[PDB]
């Protein structure tokens, strides 16, 4: 959801800090919010995506550098009579970004450029380790500080590669603690309001 | 009290930023500007490595100078706020 540059306390778990934006959990949470928020407009009607439509779009932010509204249209098989609610369309307006895993592809590009990963391969790093990386580069900005956070968690050549290319900032409103419980409810096809009430 | 690169994010929080709301406008606004300026400079301190036109050694110097300036800015914001009675 909303993002800001200063760290802060979580609104649901007040003892925990806000999750960094450029983490696997936060980017997946932002994607799930968008995915479940998306509505289709057509001939005066409004509708949300079917669970099939959402599942078809799910993994596409993770395989192309970017998910625009146009590729979503093509992949969903929408007719020209169908349009995306929220998109202003008074501009190609569907060239706009629907979702971009900036952190996922930043880490990939860093490992690819140094020779530790192939170009169109998926990122061979656990979600938890992607989270620690995004956190470290968001709370700390020097090699020394960042190394102190990651030196015992990931391999030396990987850290060298990240130190040479990665630059992250901004935080979401929810801690990683609450997100790691809200997200897999949103993955089963639940909205942001159900998951929060279901848990808090 | 003391700002370093390694406690910057722990002190430049929105909770601490909201503590400045006890200050009158002509003391609050400059401190808020320094605070936010430090946050912005700290946040983008590694952007030089995203630039493939900069060598990694050159991006290092720029990274170090940007973090040091952000630390100086936040230290000033905290110092000026402490002189008006705010405790961190």
GROMACS .gro file of C-alpha atoms in nm, chain A:
model
  200
    1UNK     CA    1   0.000   0.000   0.000
    2UNK     CA    2   0.112   0.358   0.075
    3UNK     CA    3   0.486   0.420   0.101
    4UNK     CA    4   0.705   0.670   0.286
    5UNK     CA    5   1.080   0.719   0.329
    6UNK     CA    6   1.107   0.735   0.710
    7UNK     CA    7   1.095   0.417   0.915
    8UNK     CA    8   0.809   0.394   1.162
    9UNK     CA    9   0.607   0.167   1.387
   10UNK     CA   10   0.357  -0.080   1.245
   11UNK     CA   11  -0.009   0.010   1.287
   12UNK     CA   12  -0.117  -0.347   1.369
   13UNK     CA   13   0.189  -0.462   1.569
   14UNK     CA   14   0.306  -0.142   1.740
   15UNK     CA   15   0.631  -0.295   1.867
   16UNK     CA   16   0.748  -0.384   1.515
   17UNK     CA   17   0.899  -0.157   1.249
   18UNK     CA   18   0.739  -0.087   0.913
   19UNK     CA   19   0.842  -0.331   0.642
   20UNK     CA   20   1.082  -0.203   0.379
   21UNK     CA   21   0.912  -0.154   0.043
   22UNK     CA   22   1.181  -0.340  -0.154
   23UNK     CA   23   1.123  -0.677   0.012
   24UNK     CA   24   0.966  -0.989  -0.135
   25UNK     CA   25   0.686  -0.978   0.122
   26UNK     CA   26   0.603  -0.608   0.076
   27UNK     CA   27   0.611  -0.617  -0.305
   28UNK     CA   28   0.393  -0.930  -0.309
   29UNK     CA   29   0.157  -0.755  -0.065
   30UNK     CA   30   0.138  -0.446  -0.288
   31UNK     CA   31   0.072  -0.674  -0.586
   32UNK     CA   32  -0.203  -0.866  -0.404
   33UNK     CA   33  -0.371  -0.540  -0.301
   34UNK     CA   34  -0.374  -0.419  -0.663
   35UNK     CA   35  -0.479  -0.759  -0.798
   36UNK     CA   36  -0.773  -0.787  -0.560
   37UNK     CA   37  -0.865  -0.419  -0.612
   38UNK     CA   38  -0.877  -0.438  -0.992
   39UNK     CA   39  -1.219  -0.400  -1.154
   40UNK     CA   40  -1.329  -0.444  -1.515
   41UNK     CA   41  -1.563  -0.188  -1.671
   42UNK     CA   42  -1.774  -0.284  -1.973
   43UNK     CA   43  -2.095  -0.139  -2.122
   44UNK     CA   44  -2.194   0.034  -1.799
   45UNK     CA   45  -2.116  -0.263  -1.573
   46UNK     CA   46  -1.840  -0.320  -1.318
   47UNK     CA   47  -1.693  -0.650  -1.202
   48UNK     CA   48  -1.387  -0.784  -1.020
   49UNK     CA   49  -1.158  -1.042  -1.172
   50UNK     CA   50  -1.250  -1.406  -1.147
   51UNK     CA   51  -1.013  -1.620  -0.942
   52UNK     CA   52  -0.890  -1.763  -1.274
   53UNK     CA   53  -0.812  -1.415  -1.409
   54UNK     CA   54  -0.623  -1.322  -1.092
   55UNK     CA   55  -0.427  -1.649  -1.093
   56UNK     CA   56  -0.336  -1.589  -1.458
   57UNK     CA   57  -0.188  -1.247  -1.369
   58UNK     CA   58  -0.031  -1.365  -1.040
   59UNK     CA   59   0.317  -1.473  -1.151
   60UNK     CA   60   0.359  -1.231  -1.442
   61UNK     CA   61   0.519  -0.950  -1.235
   62UNK     CA   62   0.788  -1.210  -1.151
   63UNK     CA   63   0.874  -1.319  -1.508
   64UNK     CA   64   0.878  -0.995  -1.713
   65UNK     CA   65   1.060  -0.682  -1.599
   66UNK     CA   66   0.719  -0.514  -1.576
   67UNK     CA   67   0.343  -0.578  -1.588
   68UNK     CA   68   0.157  -0.308  -1.779
   69UNK     CA   69  -0.218  -0.277  -1.824
   70UNK     CA   70  -0.177  -0.368  -2.193
   71UNK     CA   71  -0.014  -0.707  -2.132
   72UNK     CA   72  -0.278  -0.772  -1.865
   73UNK     CA   73  -0.543  -0.710  -2.131
   74UNK     CA   74  -0.378  -0.950  -2.376
   75UNK     CA   75  -0.313  -1.217  -2.114
   76UNK     CA   76  -0.669  -1.204  -1.973
   77UNK     CA   77  -0.819  -1.219  -2.323
   78UNK     CA   78  -1.029  -0.908  -2.261
   79UNK     CA   79  -1.243  -0.765  -2.538
   80UNK     CA   80  -1.200  -0.407  -2.656
   81UNK     CA   81  -1.531  -0.327  -2.485
   82UNK     CA   82  -1.364  -0.412  -2.151
   83UNK     CA   83  -1.162  -0.148  -1.966
   84UNK     CA   84  -0.973  -0.120  -1.637
   85UNK     CA   85  -1.138   0.074  -1.355
   86UNK     CA   86  -0.913   0.334  -1.197
   87UNK     CA   87  -0.710   0.391  -1.511
   88UNK     CA   88  -0.795   0.741  -1.631
   89UNK     CA   89  -0.774   0.649  -2.004
   90UNK     CA   90  -0.760   1.017  -2.107
   91UNK     CA   91  -0.403   0.981  -2.233
   92UNK     CA   92  -0.164   0.486  -2.487
   93UNK     CA   93  -0.298   0.500  -2.132
   94UNK     CA   94  -0.274   0.122  -2.089
   95UNK     CA   95   0.103   0.153  -2.133
   96UNK     CA   96   0.105   0.250  -1.764
   97UNK     CA   97   0.250   0.022  -1.497
   98UNK     CA   98   0.005  -0.216  -1.335
   99UNK     CA   99   0.271  -0.377  -1.116
  100UNK     CA  100   0.651  -0.394  -1.112
  101UNK     CA  101   0.860  -0.616  -0.883
  102UNK     CA  102   1.137  -0.357  -0.866
  103UNK     CA  103   1.323  -0.537  -0.586
  104UNK     CA  104   1.290  -0.884  -0.742
  105UNK     CA  105   1.439  -0.776  -1.075
  106UNK     CA  106   1.697  -0.545  -0.917
  107UNK     CA  107   1.843  -0.840  -0.726
  108UNK     CA  108   1.819  -1.054  -1.041
  109UNK     CA  109   1.992  -0.794  -1.260
  110UNK     CA  110   2.267  -0.755  -0.999
  111UNK     CA  111   2.337  -1.129  -0.995
  112UNK     CA  112   2.312  -1.154  -1.374
  113UNK     CA  113   2.552  -0.866  -1.439
  114UNK     CA  114   2.824  -1.018  -1.218
  115UNK     CA  115   2.788  -1.366  -1.372
  116UNK     CA  116   2.598  -1.543  -1.093
  117UNK     CA  117   2.260  -1.591  -1.265
  118UNK     CA  118   2.118  -1.637  -1.614
  119UNK     CA  119   1.915  -1.363  -1.780
  120UNK     CA  120   1.565  -1.516  -1.799
  121UNK     CA  121   1.595  -1.751  -1.502
  122UNK     CA  122   1.390  -1.708  -1.182
  123UNK     CA  123   1.564  -1.574  -0.874
  124UNK     CA  124   1.716  -1.864  -0.679
  125UNK     CA  125   1.686  -1.699  -0.338
  126UNK     CA  126   1.432  -1.770  -0.066
  127UNK     CA  127   1.163  -1.510   0.014
  128UNK     CA  128   1.309  -1.467   0.363
  129UNK     CA  129   1.655  -1.392   0.223
  130UNK     CA  130   1.509  -1.149  -0.032
  131UNK     CA  131   1.337  -0.981   0.264
  132UNK     CA  132   1.660  -0.951   0.464
  133UNK     CA  133   1.839  -0.803   0.161
  134UNK     CA  134   1.571  -0.541   0.100
  135UNK     CA  135   1.565  -0.454   0.470
  136UNK     CA  136   1.944  -0.420   0.493
  137UNK     CA  137   1.972  -0.187   0.193
  138UNK     CA  138   1.681   0.022   0.328
  139UNK     CA  139   1.802   0.071   0.686
  140UNK     CA  140   2.173   0.099   0.594
  141UNK     CA  141   2.362   0.264   0.309
  142UNK     CA  142   2.733   0.189   0.365
  143UNK     CA  143   2.919  -0.130   0.280
  144UNK     CA  144   3.023  -0.178   0.643
  145UNK     CA  145   2.670  -0.147   0.785
  146UNK     CA  146   2.508  -0.354   0.509
  147UNK     CA  147   2.778  -0.622   0.536
  148UNK     CA  148   2.723  -0.650   0.911
  149UNK     CA  149   2.360  -0.737   0.841
  150UNK     CA  150   2.411  -0.987   0.557
  151UNK     CA  151   2.758  -1.139   0.604
  152UNK     CA  152   2.628  -1.445   0.794
  153UNK     CA  153   2.307  -1.484   0.591
  154UNK     CA  154   2.412  -1.500   0.223
  155UNK     CA  155   2.719  -1.601   0.025
  156UNK     CA  156   3.014  -1.358  -0.014
  157UNK     CA  157   3.004  -1.340  -0.395
  158UNK     CA  158   2.631  -1.266  -0.378
  159UNK     CA  159   2.682  -0.980  -0.130
  160UNK     CA  160   2.962  -0.832  -0.340
  161UNK     CA  161   2.726  -0.835  -0.639
  162UNK     CA  162   2.444  -0.667  -0.445
  163UNK     CA  163   2.680  -0.406  -0.299
  164UNK     CA  164   2.778  -0.310  -0.655
  165UNK     CA  165   2.428  -0.251  -0.796
  166UNK     CA  166   2.143  -0.233  -0.539
  167UNK     CA  167   1.982   0.089  -0.413
  168UNK     CA  168   1.655   0.065  -0.217
  169UNK     CA  169   1.436   0.306  -0.022
  170UNK     CA  170   1.081   0.363   0.112
  171UNK     CA  171   0.868   0.162   0.357
  172UNK     CA  172   0.512   0.031   0.352
  173UNK     CA  173   0.271   0.088   0.641
  174UNK     CA  174   0.269  -0.269   0.778
  175UNK     CA  175   0.548  -0.463   0.948
  176UNK     CA  176   0.691  -0.780   0.796
  177UNK     CA  177   0.547  -0.961   1.099
  178UNK     CA  178   0.187  -0.874   1.016
  179UNK     CA  179   0.249  -0.902   0.641
  180UNK     CA  180   0.379  -1.259   0.677
  181UNK     CA  181   0.037  -1.347   0.823
  182UNK     CA  182  -0.184  -1.123   0.606
  183UNK     CA  183  -0.021  -1.209   0.271
  184UNK     CA  184  -0.094  -1.587   0.257
  185UNK     CA  185  -0.458  -1.510   0.334
  186UNK     CA  186  -0.460  -1.261   0.046
  187UNK     CA  187  -0.295  -1.535  -0.164
  188UNK     CA  188  -0.593  -1.766  -0.105
  189UNK     CA  189  -0.820  -1.499  -0.256
  190UNK     CA  190  -0.907  -1.271   0.035
  191UNK     CA  191  -0.915  -0.892   0.039
  192UNK     CA  192  -0.707  -0.662   0.259
  193UNK     CA  193  -1.005  -0.601   0.490
  194UNK     CA  194  -1.091  -0.968   0.546
  195UNK     CA  195  -0.732  -1.067   0.625
  196UNK     CA  196  -0.684  -0.781   0.872
  197UNK     CA  197  -1.012  -0.849   1.052
  198UNK     CA  198  -0.949  -1.225   1.039
  199UNK     CA  199  -0.623  -1.166   1.227
  200UNK     CA  200  -0.678  -0.846   1.427
   0.00000   0.00000   0.00000
